[PDB]
Design an enzyme around this catalytic site. Sequence first.
Site, PDB file in Angstrom:
ATOM      1  CD  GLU A 183      -1.745  -2.552   1.180  1.00  0.00           C
ATOM      2  OE1 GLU A 183      -0.661  -2.815   1.745  1.00  0.00           O
ATOM      3  OE2 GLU A 183      -2.526  -3.440   0.813  1.00  0.00           O
TER       4      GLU A 183
ATOM      5  CG  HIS B 181     -11.606  -7.821   5.911  1.00  0.00           C
ATOM      6  ND1 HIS B 181     -11.089  -8.698   6.848  1.00  0.00           N
ATOM      7  CD2 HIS B 181     -10.755  -7.858   4.858  1.00  0.00           C
ATOM      8  CE1 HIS B 181      -9.975  -9.238   6.375  1.00  0.00           C
ATOM      9  NE2 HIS B 181      -9.767  -8.764   5.160  1.00  0.00           N
TER      10      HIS B 181
END
Lengths: 383, 383, 329, 329
Positions: free
Chosen positions: C63, C133
Amino acid sequence: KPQFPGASAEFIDKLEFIQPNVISGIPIYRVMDRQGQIINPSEDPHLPKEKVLKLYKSMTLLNTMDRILYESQRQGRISFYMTNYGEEGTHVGSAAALDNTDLVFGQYREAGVLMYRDYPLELFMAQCYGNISDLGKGRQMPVHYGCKERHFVTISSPLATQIPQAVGAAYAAKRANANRVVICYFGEGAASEGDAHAGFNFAATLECPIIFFCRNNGYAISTPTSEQYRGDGIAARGPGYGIMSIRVDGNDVFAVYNATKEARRRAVAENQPFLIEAMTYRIGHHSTSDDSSAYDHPISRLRHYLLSQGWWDEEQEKAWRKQSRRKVMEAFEQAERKPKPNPNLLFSDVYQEMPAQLRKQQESLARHLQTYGEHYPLDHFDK
Amino acid sequence: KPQFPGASAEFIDKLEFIQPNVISGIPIYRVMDRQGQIINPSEDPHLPKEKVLKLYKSMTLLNTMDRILYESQRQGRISFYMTNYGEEGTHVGSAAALDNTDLVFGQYREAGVLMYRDYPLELFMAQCYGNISDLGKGRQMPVHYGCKERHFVTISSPLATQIPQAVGAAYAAKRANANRVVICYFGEGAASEGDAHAGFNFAATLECPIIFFCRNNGYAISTPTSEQYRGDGIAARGPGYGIMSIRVDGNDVFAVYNATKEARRRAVAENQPFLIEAMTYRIGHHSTSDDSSAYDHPISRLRHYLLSQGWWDEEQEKAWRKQSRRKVMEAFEQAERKPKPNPNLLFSDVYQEMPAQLRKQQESLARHLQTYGEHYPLDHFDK
Amino acid sequence: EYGQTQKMNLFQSVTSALDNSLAKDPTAVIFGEDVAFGGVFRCTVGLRDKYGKDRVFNTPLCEQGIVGFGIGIAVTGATAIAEIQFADYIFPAFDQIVNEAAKYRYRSGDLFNCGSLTIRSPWGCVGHGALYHSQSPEAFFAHCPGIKVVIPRSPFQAKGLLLSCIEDKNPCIFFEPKILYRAAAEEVPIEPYNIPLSQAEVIQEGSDVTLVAWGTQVHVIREVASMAKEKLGVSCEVIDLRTIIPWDVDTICKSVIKTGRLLISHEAPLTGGFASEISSTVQEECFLNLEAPISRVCGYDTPFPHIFEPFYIPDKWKCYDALRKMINY
Amino acid sequence: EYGQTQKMNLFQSVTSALDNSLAKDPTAVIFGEDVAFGGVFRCTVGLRDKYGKDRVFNTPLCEQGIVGFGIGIAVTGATAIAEIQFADYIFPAFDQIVNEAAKYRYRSGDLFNCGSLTIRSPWGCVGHGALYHSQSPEAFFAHCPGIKVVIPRSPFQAKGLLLSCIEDKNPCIFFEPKILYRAAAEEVPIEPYNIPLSQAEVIQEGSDVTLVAWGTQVHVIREVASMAKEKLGVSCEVIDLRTIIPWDVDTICKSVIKTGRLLISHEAPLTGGFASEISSTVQEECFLNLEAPISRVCGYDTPFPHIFEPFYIPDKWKCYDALRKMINY
Ligand SMILES: Cc1ncc(C[n+]2c([C-](O)C(C)C)sc(CCOP(=O)(O)OP(=O)(O)O)c2C)c(N)n1
Ligand SMILES: Cc1ncc(C[n+]2c([C-](O)C(C)C)sc(CCOP(=O)(O)OP(=O)(O)O)c2C)c(N)n1
Ligand SMILES: [K+]
Ligand SMILES: [K+]
Ligand SMILES: [K+]
Ligand SMILES: [K+]
Ligand SMILES: [Mn+2]
Ligand SMILES: [Mn+2]
């Protein structure tokens, strides 16, 4: 002679760039062939029958559990699942080479390590169901296992974060003169994270007794390794950090065992990191949330070895297949029937001690449920 | 033969860990010795006199500016400064090998690149003083230079952040069919950051026309390289990512030039990254905030070469020293006398446009200064 | 209002926005983890086939690299649409977003910028996402001048807001409520259209209390407004904030000036959550009009739990009860 | 009450706390960039020679690595005191702090923890630090359940608060106002002592208005209280918050209940700054007691500028003016 502090080398009077050796990379260490035959007797670990049977039964019991839990997820009984197909040999072969008190840090696809360490089927199931018996108190998604007693650090979803953490734990062990090693498992995709670079470098500079174990299964979800890196896999990165490295056939429990055993011996003795890249293939879907069709097995190989020694047969295979299924189903059925933990557990362990403002929120929920409880699944949760 | 998708290799039937060779690392490319003599005639780039004199004059002018600015910081005239002592050859040698429109991303110790690109002395001074003429509008600390016209991306303090950014710029250049390369400079300390790992890998997998240029000067503030890494410096890391790599004598303008010229040629033609590790030594303090004592030269080397071609002498040396000191002192004194920019510039460029709530804060400051203005240095700032 | 429409769920509206962008802007590229095959939430399906492998491609799993790379593309003036797999994994890129992206234009005196970068990421609860999540990280970014943070409530809103993000001359983070990806579809124009940033939408007019939320929570407060009218005879003004920063202070204050009461709700934890900024600001601007303390109905100050999700979220019952007490004040 | 004291400036009080810690806790280690030679701010001088190279040592230049490494040491039960060179560089470790450290205990059902980790970092403006040597990032961390964030205002406070952080059973972030490192000295006990976390300190009693700040800003509001007494005859209660999270809600509310007015000030930018959480909470708890809108005097919503620092900071004049207006409301 060059006098630069940053490197130790000689001068060269011709311009020559160093080419990576990717087409002919680091070779893959293999002990037995696909027919389960020892290729080079000098490399045979000569593990005792009881030990090899444990390796086989741990791998097969895990496969049995995967099939059942994968199906359970398709039926919506558990919210999520990740299988270990094709990778059972890397888990058990490496776990068997460690001392049972060596601390393990993992990613999420190393359940065989826990199985080998005799983690109860009841506890694997409890975590997947988030029921009252879960030592994780139902807080994390399925397959996010942890066991203090069996020295297996609780799994977390963020990839590679456990890498520099494992290094810190290895440094602490070194200081404590424990004569312990730390092993840290991760996939080839996770190896692309900045934390992998941090961990590899820190272990070498700080001289830590740690084994970095990379499961290279060819894909990170839908991403093939050709889009993951361009060097010779992960093993080729090790030397640049000053880390002793090796590549092994992950479908060969013995090659995995041998490499892990030697790495452990030397890591502990020399306080130096070791890197093992185990080559395999991700046979199942990445997860229950993935349909892999959109983009040589460790169990059969060991089975052929067992037959060759007169240590197994079709009848024993059939009986074990039956017994393993009964054991998993027993634990599965028990797990499903248990209630979930008390909703109050949503607030504890955020801090060791519950802050007053957090207790106020806990009390808020209690009052809310007293008045609006009929709109909540209170009957499925403890108390 | 191995079938694993993650690597291309043969099987090996013996357990062998791959050792790094740090004692006999990647050799250091050199073109001329410490006496300015060309060691191997076929490696001599035979650069024209005018060009070599420009390399020499850029290095010495930068050195003169460093001396003056360093002293001015000690005299409390500028708040901070970072010298380039001992690294002037890595800057000019590499800059001379690039096309003038090749985009540069740097760290903070690459001012000689701007000097070679004829960045005005007035602008180096404007930035250090944070005056009205500063293209950066006095917002960043000294030595955080930037030049759109000369294709030099504004320096920022966070180490290594420019590394993956430079890779993205290279990818965009590839797409634009530019026929341009991106060069990205960083120190051996910054190479320890996770962003370095991100950039090296992305450049290789995404096939980007980029040159990664590492200045390995032996220390990152007080930290020697022995505490920074344990592999064979930074160059040894390149191959593991599939990157063509080389190590050069940073105190040799011609070795730096040659390596950079060849890397550019190949990066642009092949769309593949190149890594150059230039070995040097940090002669000065880390900065004006650091006192080094608590923990050959590129200029004299080139000067020796100049004398052998009959291209320089003591009279020219004296004349140039005198002229450069005068040019630097004139820019310095002019910069010090300029007002700082309008305080309203504190609010613009946060976004392209000025959000109404940000405008409100600007209005609040204007009202505040109408009443309490006597307590602020208003007369030193543009109105 | 906008020509030929087509029924689209939220993931489909994102694909439409992306398709429209690549069609009209040849510099635009889309990249991140697993985007080539269509994405783990199908948001990029067919784009690589249509626009080419050089324009829709997978990156390494990193990322910090994704955002740094996207900033570099934007520095050259090309449109860079980065994807972060789950908002929960945007943290490794925090430094690139906060210290770099947000400060790029300012620190260079406008010599350089990364205005053409947009970062899109799945966000919010999903029923069983647990700690990693399910997160709603908007308040972490709200304290960073230089970036825009935008969150839509529906497919029509998502396409218009995402197009405005992609085209905006500032780095933008566009959070896509994942629970809505496959929820109900709605008619969405097939050709490009824009919905402005830094503008809240009063979706239901009311006179007794103002309710503010964003993402999926807007649907929760619409239901609370219905419950309040039915059970209490209370008229609620329902507002979708849409843009977290820079936020529409004016629309919110105007509503509160009329109603005299405000309730803000968000899935994110209470402490340091964006409701504190709204509440503080409203109290500053509407002190003479406020008839009750401003209510904040948020997620608890805990990580986001797996099995306990139904008890964690600021559902319609928690919002209704808080509203009831605020009305009785 | 604390035994023999010595005049110490902030850097000295930090070394003293660290020395006391390593002396009584054989598992404790200190590590980070350049800490071996004594640190860039001199906070670790003499420690390596006294306790050994294995206990006070340099790491590679990698903040995500430093925090991940520290968490790992703490997982084994050893005390890990990590240093982040400047708070501005803590962001590369944001993921390890927020996703890992903060949630370690919770997510494992208390099977594992990193309670023995403390991260210390230089913080706040320093006159010429510009964008990257001046930041005050506490509000970014305030939205993360699971960590404690502590900021002292003086040498005596620093040693006591730091010892409390080191000994606390939860991951702590301790921000040291760097402008105070070599500022005035004050008497500091040579022997270890603790100052409780989550406890604000009323350093001056007042009846007309409550002033709240932390770090160097406490000194600014002390001066504002003096200015208000002399120029307006207003009696200010001056409060040092000390702990950002979990904060002492009670002490602040009790004060505002008495005074009826509140002004909060911080160097960090206004939007999403921590003053918004305090303001929102006080308005919720003291609605009946508030005579005026709560005032927030903070840095502007910009990056931290070089040449403009004198115009950026929420100085005594800005705070005084806001207070005058709030009193006249
Ligand atoms: C920092 C970060 N970025 C992305 C992801 C998403 N993710 C995953 C999850 O969220 C799991 C735990 C459900 S798994 C995964 C692929 C990892 O591939 P790998 O080669 O490391 O491991 P496997 O081939 O064994 O799955 C990603 C990108 C993630 N978990 N963490
Ligand atoms: C992410 C991060 N961490 C730490 C620092 C502190 N720092 C620096 C500053 O703050 C300068 C810009 C004033 S310079 C520096 C050492 C860099 O060493 P290097 O080998 O990369 O480069 P040099 O030997 O040329 O200075 C650090 C640790 C920093 N700037 N960025
Ligand atoms: K992890
Ligand atoms: K930088
Ligand atoms: K944009
Ligand atoms: K602690
Ligand atoms: Mn994989
Ligand atoms: Mn260096």
